[model samples]
Target chain A: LKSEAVALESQAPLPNVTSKILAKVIEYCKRHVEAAASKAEAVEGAATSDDDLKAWDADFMKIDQATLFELILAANYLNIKNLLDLTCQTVADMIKGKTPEEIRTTFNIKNDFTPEEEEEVRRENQWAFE
Target chain B: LPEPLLLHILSFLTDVRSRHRAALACGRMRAAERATRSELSLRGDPRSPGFLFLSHAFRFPALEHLDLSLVSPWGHPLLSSVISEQNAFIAARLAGCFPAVTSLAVYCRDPTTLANLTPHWQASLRRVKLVRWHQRPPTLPDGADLEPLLETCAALRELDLSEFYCWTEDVVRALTTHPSATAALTHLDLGLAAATDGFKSSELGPIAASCPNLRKLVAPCLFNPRFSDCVGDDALLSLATSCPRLTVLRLSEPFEEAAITVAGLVAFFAALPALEDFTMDLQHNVLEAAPAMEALARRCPRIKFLTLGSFQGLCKASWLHLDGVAVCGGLESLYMKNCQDLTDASLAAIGRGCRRLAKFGIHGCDLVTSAGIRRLAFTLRPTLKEVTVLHCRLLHTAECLTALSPIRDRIESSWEMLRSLSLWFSAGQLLSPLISAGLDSCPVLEEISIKVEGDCRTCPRPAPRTIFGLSDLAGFPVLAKMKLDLSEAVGYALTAPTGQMDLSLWERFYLHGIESLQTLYELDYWPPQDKDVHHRSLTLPAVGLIQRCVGLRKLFIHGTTHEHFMTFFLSIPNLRDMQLREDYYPAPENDLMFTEMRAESWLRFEVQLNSRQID
Candidate 1:
């Protein structure tokens, strides 16, 4: 599978994914592969603790937004489903349960939404806002 | 990331709160989320959920799960409104409002409103739950309205009409066959709340013919017997070939004992080889339950929950271990009530075979002695979480009840501390301090009920006038719910630490400031034999009149003078329902006064006291 992906046109190296991002994606794939191998033989929560894996994932995601964005692209380009899921899930975690201002600061996005537009969004879905 | 990746990331987000927050973030984020967020829950708000579509111009690209209960709807709740005055091929209306919704759950809605539901959404819909959301259940829909609704969603995998429980014969017939029976439907919930003839397993021929995916079907017996379907040999034979995939099947309520022939039950199990969860009532003595149980064990290996009742016919005590592998090996919860023949042998077999059993309850089974329960507890000690055996003359004694020596590690540790201990003693029986001592081991016990009847012939009692103690009760960190059935003991107790206290168990609950107390039942009936023969009158404790616990919602106090409890009554601001079985005769303040108080109580307090006297 590795040889085929490397020989395939899709693995020619995505222009936007930096070496740092690709390395993290590769490490993620390695760990998940190791985890999946023993699944059939392993008791429900053997080999590694779910808490430990979650903690490790949280630690791996401590990088700056630009690197995080690059990792998502690298995982998607490599067609590594688990890696893609992890990166996508990490991005979802960054956006969810957070204030709009916190999300803006996390992603370094400008506050492009006007007060009137924000009010409209809040009113349109008051149950969510409340 | 690009738009596709961004949308993919947003799709992973489940919180409606988060999506709403992110939707206000940036122009691109808002548009990206608009197309990805899937479900819309209109639960908390009571306005029109119509705003959901109005905001998006009635077109949500990905909204598939819509929970439009009576609270709020994009359109006025067509089901709950006292007057939708308007609203289906209701599915046609549904398809227009939520074009992509594959699952819709509504509360307090009528089935007829979907009369226009003419779409062929059978392939898309996975589930539909139309429930009655109000204090008053919805009125029955016109039987004529059900056919079009099921016809529209003919392919739905799950249908729950039991929420409020109104399914007419015509609609039920369409459920199995109209233009088509639901081939993909895995679940069907019917309520016997009203009269409908087709509930018996006999009519399931078309149901079996079409719905091959039927896994869980529950026709729970409702009160008010309007004469629905009755399962017999004919229905079982129909189900034998057709409903093979059923994993959870309840012929009727567990203890209803509605009478299904033994041959019918045996044949039903023949087809349902994969059956795991079941609730069936065996009417009276069936010669014996040895064969019924053996048949169950022979066919179904995945049986996890079984509730069988009213079976007085005895089974061999050896049945539990007589199995080749294990009878009911997968059984976790077993409820057998009023089965008088539940002897030591049956319980022992269970102890040996059912290692994973968590909840075991036996009530009114006269043959089960104290030793029977003792052995079962020791055997299932590793897994048993709750053991409720009531009215078993022998089990109430301290010598027998104390036999349950529970160790800390044996119980599931959600809360290391145990809670709730209610003990009702028979008349002439003395307060077993050893039982309280046994109770101290529970440590965190809340919800306490103690009653001693003056005429318990089955369980022998100690000498009369034997005083009782309850100091260890205050030792519990929080005793939120309590009921003292101590007749003639409604008065005082010598509480711990220093002196005699004016308060009984109820006063202890109010004084402790745990404040979380929600339910309190204080009952004591002055037995006819001991009428006014007592030497001393005990003083029930006093909390300032009208003090507020702010949490107490349900209180059932028996034999209390209303004037004495007037101060204790006003305490809990949130007490919604209270029933007082008055022992002391109510003073005649006049017919007009009773009327005035009833009006005042309704206006100010939601509690309802029967206000009737008991000896």
Candidate 2:
């Protein structure tokens, strides 16, 4: 199944995402790059809707958490720094204020460290993690 | 994920807790987090209870940037212990553990902790943000100088010592003495809690003299009445001469008597040739010094930005016509704010002379009006890009727009050259025909601001919308920004039914009227629905319906609730920025609930509150 999926990813091509989302990423990169290139060039660039972009971003994050996590992993694998960061930040927003036990259950990961080891880590970081 | 991918993921963790959580995800995640933890931050957040501990535990061996904001947990028993623990941990790990750390920010109650950590991190640290110095006066260590820290950091480019009260003459001297501190220090922000016996400039002169390469200098105006008796112009002149490479200088609340005289300013300008941006509100001791003012203008030929107040002496045309000083070579933007002495003639002389003039503002120049603007409009039409006459009367005449017609024609012919042309009339009847005529003259005009009084004699009785039609505005094809003040108007036009009152004609007229407008930037409708039905439903959509302009970038609607404005704004796809002033036209009793409107997007946004009517 994994092999077939990999082959499908490599050969059949991934399903095209919303042009608006891709366009946003492309626009961000293009704007930063152009802005860094020269003030004059950046001034000459086409105007984009700042509100639309923000609204698009707000709606884009509305996808399921599991799907979002997979996309983040994919973005990381593809070396898309911005996408990776965005997804990681989304995951961080979810993890913040949650207990360690809750986080383990939420992400469906088994606790590798023993109870004592976990306690030791907690004790070491108690000052900062308080 | 690859190593690069892991590092990229780790860079998103700006908070200390986030990095710890990432590290706890698994061994692979921990390794990735450790690899890129140098870029993470634990910046000042007083409410986050456990940030300090989290920051210390997930220490990246290759940490390059660290920001620790330790808030004083008022009456928290564990606060002192946590501070001491974090201080000790940071001190021990400073050199060996994070040898590559280049940026450090520490906020703590004790200065000794900061003094101890400086030596260890000084060599590699290029940026520092220190806060919460003992509020009580600093007691320097006997014979233990702080000079070495300044001497060591050759790569130090920025320093922000906000709210660090213990700064003394010795510390300032140490910074001045360092070779890189003088030349390499481009940005310096210092905050002194207690007043020095003398002025700040006197105490800071040595440092200012050493750092001739300073680009930005922000210090309190120690020349206020309290300290004016002690401070003098010599200190200011010395600062100007020493910091020859200064670009941006700000002095807050300047004393009336102790301000640098026009003569001294002329001398300072002569010494500092590179000064470009200057903002000072000094008293008018040297208002009569014409020769000195003219000399200063000549000396600082390249000064493009300036902000002066009402009392500053006016530089008449005769002063610029002096044989030795025929012209101000590189002057561009001049802001003469609150200069009551400024008359129409003096302003016209300036417009005629300064051919490269781009922005000219005469805020609260009450003597200026439509006639003066007409003269300026004819004289400066060639090079002028923007002119603002705010908080003034006599700008209500249709002739003001008529005078600007030529400049508008030139802009329309050239597609992308001209950017902004703003004419604000505080009181007037902005008839539909006049707006259409003025807009037709300037097709490239990006913004049009006009204040309207519905009761004015020139204003049509049935409302211009019912007479000439809003469709006439379509003639002004290039207007991307428009601001209309409809506070005095009584009835609404847009939302009225076709049979009850034909608004479809007005809608269709305006929809086709501004074909070239890409943005319906700002709309301020006053008088609530229950208070005034015309303002509530009619005038808003009448003006707001112009958002059909395909190039519209922002939409700001005041005099409505956030929910109400949001519903209207969401329908406009191209609208990038939105500002809603909830309590724009507030009742007298609702003063506590009123708040100023703020913009929410990237595009151009402007908001003006309706001032209370003076009887």
Candidate 3:
């Protein structure tokens, strides 16, 4: 399964990630590979024990924000639904009810629009705010 | 919130306002959802082989939504020739194959269909359908078996359980008491479901508190004619106050006894300024329907789909007695059932109010006459393509009440052909040109279904008129489906128009293209009751004018007898599907030909006339 021939068959050289993230991606894929076998074998029995799956992912995401961004690129390129959904959902969870300014600050994203433009967006979504 | 962050987390906030904030957060989140929006569904006879073909694995790692839309094979035509024997197992198995699905719309033949879903997908299901339960044989999930399921699906945003009859107090209790996601639902379709007795606003109270995101709700039968299972003014008042965002609501039903009188009606609507579609039983004489609807016309300016049906009897039941000009300028569909005694004045009030009326269904409003309709029709103009009047007695009389109306050329010029017209007259046999006149008035009128008298077969029923007719329908152009339910009637009258047709009359139909019409319900064709019954008349001409249009595929015309119609079968070839009543229309003869049409090929000829019932 770790063979280059196998990787090449699926496709080689990830499209949206770096080789540094690639090693981490392989580590994550191996864990689900075993779990996928068991998951296929039985309804309750997945290839890997789900015990602490949550804590494990949480622990994994404990990396710095810059590292987390790379995690998105890695998960997306590897064609992993679970990884991408988990990371995206985790990122989404952080700003669940945070203010727009707070969200920008938390993600360190630029406030691309002017005050007037942002206010326009606010009014467009006023009901949601209320 | 649709989440710039929540994309990674189901998170703590799944409520509408919050999610809406996210969707509108930057609109980028919504754009992302669109990118990955892939839907795969499977439906059809649960018994089909394909229904069992779930092994086909589709792994869309980013698959965000998995939707299933199913209907039975019994209804769809392509299903007839399809072959399916293996339903060996695993709809539940199929459920396991998908990663995470967003919505599920299931109409199964129930129970295991739901129970079979794996726990992960089960709890994750967002849109659920508790609809279509008022069905006979009842639903698979009823009585006490529903609570636990409702308790679990608290995260749902849409809950549609059709008309609450099959639902129990226990069911109502569950929806009202969910913990966190309780407020998530924004769309609820629970109209008239309280029939198994009734559900009160008392129960509705908690639901209102829990489900504030509700944008559309239909709980029409607060109390029904059966008895008093209802909510009073206080409960409904509270309910209305909580959900100001409501745009569509059906709060009334015929013979329904609800607590919302004119006072409650006015106050209730006052809270929902966003309302666009509203319906209620208007003959609420006690609350004073006149004032109620009048206030309605004034308050709800954006109403488009307005139905004020059933006040019973007639005008005594009609409360449409408004005092001013109409302002519901947005009205596109106005259906008023049992609006009797309403006249030109009423339509005139509406004329000024909603000059843009398109589809109108007026049932039992006897006082509406031609002059009024002429004005109303002209005003609604080319926009009024569909007019369905049930028992309105649009009939006028000279020799008798044949269908009414003789128009001036100017009025005729103003008339654009109609898209569809369904009218029911007081008696059988439309006064010649009755329906023909309807055809005449509506140049492009594609469908005309006319029912006279016996819509409900009242046995102590004195005989209504004889076999009906469209006699010389040659004038009709573009008439696609003419279903004259001349079924269930007295013995035929040979002199009656429909029975007097031979080759020439059909020739007119052929000349005009109606000859090739696809579906015709012209059963009860000849005089079995004329006492002069058997005089093997001129061998029914080779399919006559209808013969010209090889397109005539299905024929159910009445009167043509055993030997006569049977022998003449082969003349017109394209005719494929045919149906026959056991003893084909009117009084039964001792024998049913047990006739089987030429089995092989173009036509499905086996016309099983008896319980000899080989459908």
Candidate 4:
């Protein structure tokens, strides 16, 4: 327990990662770290534990887009591959089946393409739009 | 997001449509998309001076998997030589554009087209699926030699020749006997060529001997026209001894007598201890089921997925075979079709022993009834996930409803893993309360398919409005894929308003319930049985109701549809593929026109969304 506490205290210096985002990233890492450490003992409920982790990860991702993007940056800077994958997958799912207009509205990003330019882009990738 | 981070985000969006939409967001996203994209598909004719449209392919420099299998020159009326030359040029251009690609799927009508591409991809290619497009003109020979490509791309690890219809022994010999591919090739699928037009049994011997590294193989149909049946005994023996690491095998035959028998099978299973998934389709054979099942369980103890058919020697013998399969623990999926001897006793054996079974399917088992299925549902409730019982004549709808009806005491705790259920029932049956209770028990159910069998011509009470008995199917939030085949139920009396109103209410019910479905919907119904059965168009109502599933991507209909309905279908926002098989009766000149228009629509839709992957 003392060794685990010491390992958790050694944090990296990431300027882009705010305290709020860093706290969430640390929480994710702690739970995953503890889960992996205890997996050797509980061999019977392995499937149930994996499903519980998935459900916990899903509940942890219910945040606004602003918080989500910040979490992605924090996970990237902290070098946590699983966290980065989760955050990036969340953003990808938002843009997965949506139209360009729908995506722009979701991310609150302005459409920079003019009417003619928009038509040109659509024409270039006509099959994709179809 | 910074450029690297944005590229990382774009890497997660793999589909072409989603990437294009993200590119339309802004310039940074577009730049990121170009760098992270690793897969690209070129479909349809790129027009003459094809490089103009193909030049856009260079935008994605990181592409490792390139697909051009959908491109065809069938629409052109030009000379065969010209089409061949055009295809060769496009193939060369694609090779030059994506030199670092590791995986490729492309179409070929002539040998020169593949020859032009394989030289550039020799060092990098690891997997390729070459589709032999149709051979119509004399310039495109049906027996074009493909050995040169295999000889050239010696570094390939996986090759799929399933779509190549004219499979010959010489082509297979060259593929297996090649120096590098003999050891490098791990997966090979020679699809339907064997089953449709059988090959000699001796052809498999070269593959088993040469490709010792092979882990998965779909063996060709064995037949002999000039001599006795090609038993394929030596070939199976060679595979068992040489390919010890082989894990998956699929052996099917168009006819039963020409292929391996029970003795050959026992010898084949003696080796290949790593075999985990096996499928065999034998329609009628003289082999007993007991010995084959016993051999498989004793030798290949690691088997997880098994699909078998037509091993019905005796009812008692089949029951013994089921016992052997259940004793083979760690079994996950067991699918049996046309095993006519299976009855309630057979299901009881599996329910008692298969502790970790997840998926079970039974097709054309005439002796199995609801009582048999109920035992499995009750005994294996915790582990079972997918259940399919189709064409089991003894399984009346009423009995089936009760069979799946969870034990009232532990109803809420049962069926914990059930995600898909498919069943078939007779035409006159109505949705009873037992079915509602049965469906409600599967809390995790996602896909349901109900197919009716006989024609409902007699006058009767009005059937339920909704396709299923459930009044509010939206309660099953995860249900995304649905298939309803009411073709038999469409034969109600012409004078009965009950028949027409039955569908009308069903159509209304779907209008509100299907908004959450984002993937696939297949609806099959007939117009009417007789010519005089009130032919008032149901197409309009069908069209209106279907359009409500706003995010539907693939749709298939089996009944009547007009050109106007085809035109209206284009307005559905996200629809990608719409296939129609319109056959009921003879109409007017519009019949030909409708057929032509349907073909035109399908061509346009298919090229836009050719999403079927080569596995």
Candidate 5:
């Protein structure tokens, strides 16, 4: 209850966009907290269904792309490692085989490297950037 | 859990780049990285630039698992600032702060950094690996003898001096002489270096006399010519006498006639009563002396595994005249390679003498023929489980297969019990169709390495002989593993561009006959170009030949880059391990892509990622 009040107060000073994103982050964090508590209780009580936990995680990650990116940044800033990793991995999966220009276009990010710089980087480590 | 536990959990994360990014996410994670970094610094070269950068960048006073490969030379001067002066200060600090740090590898291009850190490494260091130094003529530091460091590290169990430029004599002497060096030291590996060449009889005599508790010693150049002359059998005898607990001994150099005399070696074998595995490269002359060999056999009764090479002296005359002695009472595995003088009579004698023999190899023995092999198949029919007869040019057609036919029923009963069955065809002998038919008779044959030659007139024309029906090989009900080293003619035949070859015949046969094939460990077809058309034919939906074998664990498409191999491997979900060897047909550049990428990826996946459950 104390943590809930603190979580609520933390979103009060945020901008509208920030507040909405932070609220989503809090919702995920709250779920994780519940999951952790349940896991502990399961260990103490009887047999725990790992399949149920896996299904829960799979269903939780089934949101749209825009919300996913926003959640990633929010989770990153909020220091929620699991959520941050999940979202970053999802982003990477979406752009797995795309070229830098294609990735830039998909993510609406500018190509910061000049043509010569791009060439030099390619020469240095073709596998990494690719 | 508090910050340290959280950091410990974070350290188990799969990706280093991800872990690094996560460490930068918050002040807590950053502090955790510092803790982990300090723990790493204690085991690795603290003076290395990478450690300095790690200490500075992560701002970790206590670091663990520090890799110095990434740091620049500019940070080298800050080593003293990071590591404290006291020998056990780092270990004490790590144990107090981060007790989870255990495994550490240091890549030192320069020996100076390693020499400087010797005093700092004390009893707390458990595992230490020194890798990647210059391979040219080894040069030691001005006046520093490396014996003291070996003496001090009492807790050190595993030490690797793979490519260091230290005197072998001084190191061996220090290890055996120093009280602390002998204690708790179990696994010693000096990989692919000539460090053992410097060892003398005086230096090794003391070590062997004192360090009585050695389990495994894996080092290249252990029996160098210089050591052989200087130390002789007396030094080895002393080691064998002292180290009553020794189980495994591997030597890279050929066994010296003068040093390890047949009599001395036999005596040594008798003394060690606990010896289980033995490998040696005895010169041809030593084996020629039947009395010496018989004496050796008399001494080593408990040896279960024996690998003998350079056996040219084991002539027909020696084998016949020498009184047949059952030296290896418990011997089950015998690998005899490049023993050209060995004949069928000698093998029969071995089979008769060593009753418990299960696996046998007569590789590169020019004198062995089908008659000699038949003698073995008939005599040792009950105990023989696996046999490899490679490069025996005198084997008669169908004679070898006829000799092996009796064991076919046994091969069908237990597959894993018998591991290998390799037979190499001569340059002009074609394997009879009856041999292929006889394959179904052996159910336990897991690995079949057959090398076919094209010049044989009895064989079918150099064409891809398509198997359209299972009727040909239907007798083989439990054939799981197969390796075909086909002739270039077969490659040319299989390279038909139209992909019109009906592999359905073979598919239907496999589906109907060998139903127990859940995993094909390795399918290596020489002349890798044939795979191009084969890959397409197998993937065709209408045919569905390749897709039918759901039990395929590993599929290798040889003659490809690491990128191609990785792509192929990733597609096969069930595949746990795969290898792609470069072929010589196309004259392609030796990229060493498969070798490098596989090592790097496997290391990152197994160690850095820590995804898989390692027992």
Candidate 6:
């Protein structure tokens, strides 16, 4: 798939995705291909195969925070659905039960609201506080 | 993350608290979250403090389902003039905000909300439910204004005007003439509307002729025997011929004298090949069930869910009816209540017949006992997932357990599929071991409610009252709801350390607070000292034990609880709803505390007292 995209008319090297992130995405895609092959062997072992894939995915996600974001960017650019979903769920789990200030610190998000705008947003959603 | 990627991630944060907090994180996050949010439910009276926030629903542009049914309208005559102008403003803002909403529900007493919303929502609105609180009649000059809204929203597929008390013939006339009802309207529920004086039998004929795609029809004709102008066999036959795609039919009349006879019932069942779910109240109508069910099983073999109630005949006709129902082996859910003829043999036959049944419930069946329930449970051990046995007179406390043990063994031995169980027992049953030991066996149990009825003093008292070891139910992965109704118990212990009092520990805990009490748990072998162990309260242990139910969102205990433990119950991290009540007698002071805490606390906390006298 990457080669097909790279063989486009431009013929320039892929820009956004690094080799390390590309290799990680390739490992995921290749492993799932084998998992799909083994799925037809026994219908009863389908659940176990899914569980094995989940465990593999969990171990695969144990990388640095910077690499994880790079992988997500690559997945989105390449339009690989499973990779995007797996990484997006990881990001969502990080935001669970977190305050706004804590979420900003975790995601390195910038607070762009002016004082009056912030107060207005807070006032509009004040029911959530109670 | 890219804006699209961020929105996909934010869509997973479906809980209200997480979504609101995520919106406050940053501008990009706020915009992404707002674009993906689709549904919202708001509840408040007109003069509520949070009434101003109703105008801010415009933040969500992609919303499809909006429910304001609990937002009550001003019912006072003196406030009518002010409410009219206020409702107009609300109606305009709401309609202007959610132009893309496909489903909307509102209280019927609110006069102008729907009228002003009709023009804006005509293109997108596909489902509308108007509910009226009992006896709260609309103050509108004429509540017949829904006819225009019905005529305008041409894409509407479902309209539930069940509890809306204001009935008029114009709504049916509009439905007959409107393009929406003719083309796409599938679910039309006019429950109790036929009992109204204005309703005529001929009103449904046009609807039947126009609506060929009707899937669910819940119009109980001739509910009142005195009302002579009601739908009869002709109307039923008309529906049978016209609406061949009808999947659900609820013609459950409350009166004994139904207008449609056995021939109509049989013909109706035979004609609708797609009928899957059906219900009819057999109030002394035992003769019609045998042939009707025979035709149902023969013609519509796809029937999956069935409910039959108020069947009282104990002779050959009832047996034949029960046997007739047994032939429909495709049924997945079957519920029978107040069935005087539901015997042990018939119950076993149903268990044998419905092999794929997942949900079975029997209420007020006086003849069904432990033997019947046990046999049924044993037979359906593989497929039964939810069971409700309530108000069975002969099934006492021991019998209830005898019936439930097979289910318990099923959960322990084989599949962990039982998701919900609610059983009513006679008072004085020792249910501690079942709660602590048997509860852990059911790994996937999501909801359980145990109710003990009658007076506990009437039974022979045991030496030591049952001490419920709630701590044994810690680390439950999926159990989210629990309700224990110990109203009749003279005295019972919730935890092992219930009667142990230590004022010095209490004061130290009070002074340093819950955060510091974590350090106290590390103290080496120290029984809390400094005061006599006279006053008993499980303030410390109860907090720790109750909080261990990590996934529990709702907790209800209808029994005695100290006022001091109110804050502890409120502080449970994940609990969203908690209801505590004094079981033995009414406690007004406790009521005041609950009222105060309900407003101040973040969770939905409530309290009630059993209004009864002591023996």
Candidate whose TM-score is highest: 4
Task: Compute the DockQ of candidate 3.
Answer: 0.08
lDDT of 1 by residue, B221-272 (tens): 4211234554444655676577688998765432313345456566666668
For model 5, the superposed segments whose C-alpha errors exceed 4 Å read: A1-130, B1-153, B157-178, B183-210, B215-231, B241-244, B252-260, B270-273, B287-290, B293-304, B311-615
Error of 1 at B415 (Å): 3.5
Best by lDDT: 4
- Residue-level lDDT tens digits of model 5 in B1-615: 122323333433433223322223213333345334522233222122222111222233444444432222211221222244442443333234334333445444343444444434454566666544323224544223444345554566766665444555545545655665666566666442443344456655665555567766654433443443443456667767877676766544523243455566666677776666665543322434345445545655545455543332343443442223333322332344434434444645554323233334556544234355455534333233223545432232223433343332111111223334555443323343424533324555666555543322233332454332223333444455655443332222223334334322222322232223453444554421233322211212212333334454444333323332233334334443333333232222222331223434432332221223211
Each prediction's number of clashing residue pairs: 26, 15, 36, 0, 19, 0
What Cα-based lDDT does every candidate model obtain?
0.46, 0.44, 0.43, 0.53, 0.41, 0.49
True-contact fraction for model 1?
Answer: 0.43
DockQ: which candidate is best?
Answer: 4
* Cα lDDT for residue B130, candidate 3: 41
lDDT of 6 by residue, B32-103 (tens): 455345324321122222245344534456677766543321111211222455655655666665557788
For candidate 5, what is the DockQ-based docking class? incorrect
- DockQ, all models: 0.24, 0.06, 0.08, 0.28, 0.01, 0.21
Instruction: Write model 4 residue lDDT over B1-615, tens digit each, in one string.
Output: 454566666677767666766674344446335433533432222222343444453444566776555332222222123355675665566665556778876655455556666777788888878665333234433334456566788778887877654555545566565756667778878763332444455666666677888898875555443445353666667766867778998776555243566787888888878888887655434346567767887888777566564454322434366456543333332344434434434645554323333334555544234345555434433233223545432223223323333221111004445566654545544433435544444566666665554444453434444343433455555566667555545543324453343444333332334444443343333333322442323445567766666656556565444456655556566565455433222221222343223444444544544433210
User: Can you write out model 3's per-residue Cα lDDT over A103-130, one digit (the tens) per residue?
Assistant: 5666655555555644444433221111
* Window of ten residues with lowest summed lDDT in model 3 chain B: B405-414
At residue A120, what lDDT does model 4 achieve? 52
How large a fraction of the reference contact set does each model reproduce? 0.43, 0.10, 0.19, 0.37, 0.00, 0.37
Off by over 4 Å in 2: A1-113, A119-126, B1-4, B23-58, B65-90, B93-99, B105-115, B129-145, B151-157, B176-184, B197-201, B224-234, B253-258, B261-615
In angstroms, give how far residue B99 of model 6 lies from its true place. 3.7
**TM-scores of chain A, one for each prediction:** 0.60, 0.52, 0.63, 0.69, 0.61, 0.69
Q: Which docking class does model 2 fall in? A: incorrect
